[PDB]
Structures are given as structure tokens and as C-alpha cells.
Amino acid sequence: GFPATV
Amino acid sequence: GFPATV
Amino acid sequence: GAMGSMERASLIQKAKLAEQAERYEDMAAFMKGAVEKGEELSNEERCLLSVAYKNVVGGQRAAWRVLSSIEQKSNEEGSEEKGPEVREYREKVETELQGVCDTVLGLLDSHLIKEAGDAESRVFYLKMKGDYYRYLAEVATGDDKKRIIDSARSAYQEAMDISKKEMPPTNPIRLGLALNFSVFHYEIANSPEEAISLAKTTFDEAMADLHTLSEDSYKDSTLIMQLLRDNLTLWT
Amino acid sequence: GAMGSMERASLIQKAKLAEQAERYEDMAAFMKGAVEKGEELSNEERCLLSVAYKNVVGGQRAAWRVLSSIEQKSNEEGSEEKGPEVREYREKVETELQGVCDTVLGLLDSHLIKEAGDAESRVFYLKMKGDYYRYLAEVATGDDKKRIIDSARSAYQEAMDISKKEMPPTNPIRLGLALNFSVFHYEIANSPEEAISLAKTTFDEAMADLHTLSEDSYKDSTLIMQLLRDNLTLWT
Ligand SMILES: *SCCNC(=O)C(C)(C)Oc1cc(F)cc(F)c1
Ligand SMILES: *SCCNC(=O)C(C)(C)Oc1cc(F)cc(F)c1
Ligand SMILES: [Mg+2]
Ligand SMILES: [Mg+2]
Ligand SMILES: [Mg+2]
Ligand SMILES: [Mg+2]
Numbered sequence A, B: 001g002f003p004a005t006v
Numbered sequence C, D: 001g002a003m004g005s006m007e008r009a010s011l012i013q014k015a016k017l018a019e020q021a022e023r024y025e026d027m028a029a030f031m032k033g034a035v036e037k038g039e040e041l042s043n044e045e046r047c048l049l050s051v052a053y054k055n056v057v058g059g060q061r062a063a064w065r066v067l068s069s070i071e072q073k074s075n076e077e078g079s080e081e082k083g084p085e086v087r088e089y090r091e092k093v094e095t096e097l098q099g100v101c102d103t104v105l106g107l108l109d110s111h112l113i114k115e116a117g118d119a120e121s122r123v124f125y126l127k128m129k130g131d132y133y134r135y136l137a138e139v140a141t142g143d144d145k146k147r148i149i150d151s152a153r154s155a156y157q158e159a160m161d162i163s164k165k166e167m168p169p170t171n172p173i174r175l176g177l178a179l180n181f182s183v184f185h186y187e188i189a190n191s192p193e194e195a196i197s198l199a200k201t202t203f204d205e206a207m208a209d210l211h212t213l214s215e216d217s218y219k220d221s222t223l224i225m226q227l228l229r230d231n232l233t234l235w236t
Helices: C008-020 C024-035 C043-074 C085-115 C119-139 C145-166 C172-188 C192-207 C215-235 D008-020 D024-035 D043-074 D085-115 D119-139 D145-166 D172-188 D192-207 D215-235
Strands: none
Touching (some): C008 D043, C024 C043, C024 C085, C043 C085, C043 C119, C043 D008, C085 C119, C085 D008, C145 C172, C172 C192, C172 C215, C192 C215, D008 D024, D008 D043, D024 D043, D024 D085, D043 D085, D043 D119, D085 D119, D119 D145, D119 D172, D172 D215, D192 D215
16 A cells, blocks of 8 residues: 555 | 467 | 767657657666766656656565565564575665666766756756655665655755745646655655645645646646545545 | 576575566576576476566567567658667667577576476476577578577477377476467468467367366366467467
8 A cells, every 4th residue: 555656 | 469378 | 878879869769669668777778878968858858767767666666665575574483584585685676776766866966956947847856856865765774864864855845945936836746746745754754744734735725726727737737636635545 | 607606595585586576587587597507497496487588588579569560660651760769779679589588598408408308397498499489580580580480390399299298188388388389380480270270189188188187287277278269269
């Protein structure tokens, strides 16, 4: 459950 | 539609 | 540089081909060559550079996490000693990742940031600087860990300050910066409340400015707003 | 070899770790190091070697096909001349692929095949020899193209002859060999009828021998039989 980055 | 190989 | 003899335009063309072929290591080597020609990058070229390195380091981070997990389980009580191999191989992947980060950071310091005067380029590069210090921080354990963390924070904070003065709240670079600085707060700085506040305030200020956008700009901004909402859902 | 100073058992352990981390280039380098220790490989070690290289070359082949497609479209009439870059980059990927094939073929010739006396090892290695000549044949255009094709055919045929004498018709190595030699006939040798006949006869002879198998052996054999059926469905 790794968070979103761009 | 490439054929299966192992 | 092994790319020193290739034309800038040919390096850019080949980076686009490498992307289509999912050859991200080649794509990053072509873009490093293009940066080292010494000219500023256009918006599209900055995107090519960031996509190439994000995919290379993203694969390294994923492999590092698999190996670090195996290493931690090997070090629990009741686990059978398997010798130095897991640590050695995790270290090998870690050193390769650190090398890629140092390469990107070096391109930014020599000399992309100092020549970047418009907000859309300067914010983009300072965001990348925070990102690659953040990846160093994910694996850092030594005397320099706090300074690595603070280098990420400092780069992100400078980018935030420029973005708040010079870009609308829906600008996708300003949004992506805030998304990633919020993840920095949650995962690196042990500051989940700051992470949640930044994500919420960024989302709400973007929402209130969507009415100004064309349909194409709306799609770009709402894509990143959805990622902010996804993270907020994970964290609350 | 850069792996010359690492213990054989540590190379095998690290190849398994690299597989878990989806680091197939590392996995192949570890297995090349293990082969170069000079000892025969066990069944599991042969599988590690084949999985590592099949994944490396499979990624190269996929990228080559993307680039070759772009190159062909760039060479149609009415297409705008984009200069030498597409060809150069397709050639770069092609030369890297050929290098990986030559590396595997070299491991097989020095000295895996000549020390392989049991059918399960000798058939496995001769199948790999046919496979990597087949990958060379996919990109071959010069004076040597026919000889590359015949080297694949010769290796596959020797493997077939041993497998028919020494292995049951459900043995998964015998099945995988037949699957791949059938693909050789269809895609390389321009012999679709031979491809279809070999796939059908292999499937039918395996079907008639499944009654002899345990539940675990049945699962392995039927997995490959399904691939033969999938190809027959594509071709008929
Ligand atoms: S630069 C890639 C093009 N833009 C995007 O894909 C989008 C909308 C996600 O915006 C950003 C991408 C990016 F790599 C960094 C950003 F800050 C925004
Ligand atoms: S060697 C990998 C283990 N076996 C398999 O996955 C299976 C059942 C597909 O059999 C073969 C794999 C392989 F790589 C080559 C074969 F001839 C069979
Ligand atoms: Mg020039
Ligand atoms: Mg604030
Ligand atoms: Mg030894
Ligand atoms: Mg026959």
C-alpha cells in the first residue's frame, strides 16, 4: 500500500 | 498474435 | 560521455524511441547525453528526462524493497542464518540506486537549476531534486541521513515557495510537487499530519480554480487531484 | 569473469534473490558465473539459467520488434525521412540481443552440452541451443542467415531424437522442446504445415500418456499441452 507520486 | 514458447 | 558524439536532436529522437520500446535505461542515457550538451531543456524534454529516470529508479526501488524485506526476515529470531548473500545483494542494488540518484542530482546541479529562470522549469527541477534526495533518504542509514532528508525538504520547500507565487493552484507541476512533498512528509519525515494537511489544502485550492481551465487542462489537473485524494484515502 | 571470486553456492542463492526481485539481468550474470565454475548443473540450476536468459532476451526481442516496426513504417512511401536514428537504435538493440545469444551459446558449447550425458540435461541444453539460434535467426539478414536457421534446426532435431528415445511423451522438457521447434517451423522456416503437424502429434501422444502420471506431473504436462493447443488455435 505505497502512495502515489509523479 | 505471437505464439507461445517456453 | 559516451553520448558526446551524438547530435542533441538525435539523442532526443532516440529517447522517444526508447520510451516506445520500454527501454528506460537507454532512454535515461540518451537524455543525460542531451542535458550534457549544455543547452536548456524544453517542457517536453524535461518530461522525457523525468520519465526516463523515474522508471529506472522506480525499478531499483522496487527491487530494493523486495531484498530489504527478505533481509529483515532473515534477521528475525528463529530464522536460519543464510550468510552474507542477502545483505551483499541488497547492498549491490542499493549502490546502483544511489549512483543513479547521484547522476540525476549531478545533472540538476551542473547546470540545469542555475540556468532555469522561468517558474515551470525551476519548479520542475527543484521537485526532481527533492525526489532524488527522497530516494536517497529511503535507503540512508549513516551519519548523513538527516542531511539527506533535509536536502530533500529544502529543495521541495524552494519549489513550493516559487510555485505558490508564480503558478496557478491547478498547474500540474505545482500539483505533482505537492503530491510528492506530501509523500515526503508521510514516508520520510515521520510527519503524517503535515502530509495530510498539504494534500488536503492542495486539493481544495485546485478544486476552486478548475473553473478557469479548458477541457484539456482540466484533464491534466484532475488526474493529479485524484492521486492526492487516493493518498488521503490511504492515510485517513 | 566478474563473478570469478564468488562462491558457486552464493551465485545460485543470489540468482534466486534476483528472480524474486525481477532483476533478470543480474540473475543471468549470476547464473553465467555459476556455469563458469565448471561443474555440471542440477535440474533446478538449469531452470534458473534458462529463466534468467529467457527473460533478458525476451525483453530485447520485444524492444527490437517495436523498433523494427517503426523502421518499416519510416521506410514506406509518403513517409517523411527521419534520418538514420531509427535504424541506428534498432541496430544497437539488435547487437545487444546478438551478444546475449552468443553468450548463452558460448556457455552451451563451453562446456555444458559435451558434459551432459543424461537425457534430461542434454535435451534441455540442445533445446536452449535451438532457442538462441532461433532468436539470432529472427534478426538475421546476411550471408549467414541460412546457416543460422540450420543451426537452430540441427540442435532442435538432435534434442527431438534423444527425447523420443529416452523420455516419455508427457515429459515437460520433451513437450517444451516440441512446442518451441513447432514455433521454429512456423515463424522461422516458413513451414506452417510442419509446425501444425508437430504440435498436433505432440499433443495427442502426451494425452494418451497422462494416465500414467501423478497429480503433480499431470499439472506440469497439461500446462504445456495447453500452450500447444493455443498455438494450434492461432494457426488453424
Ligand atoms: S512531464 C510528464 C507529463 N505530465 C504528466 O504526466 C502529469 C500530468 C502527471 O504531470 C506531471 C508529470 C511529472 F512527471 C511531474 C509533474 F510535476 C507533473
Ligand atoms: S525449467 C522451469 C520449470 N518448468 C516449467 O516452468 C515448465 C513446466 C514450463 O517446463 C519447462 C520450462 C522450461 F523453461 C523449458 C522446458 F522445456 C520446460
Ligand atoms: Mg550539434
Ligand atoms: Mg502550509
Ligand atoms: Mg568454491
Ligand atoms: Mg514427424
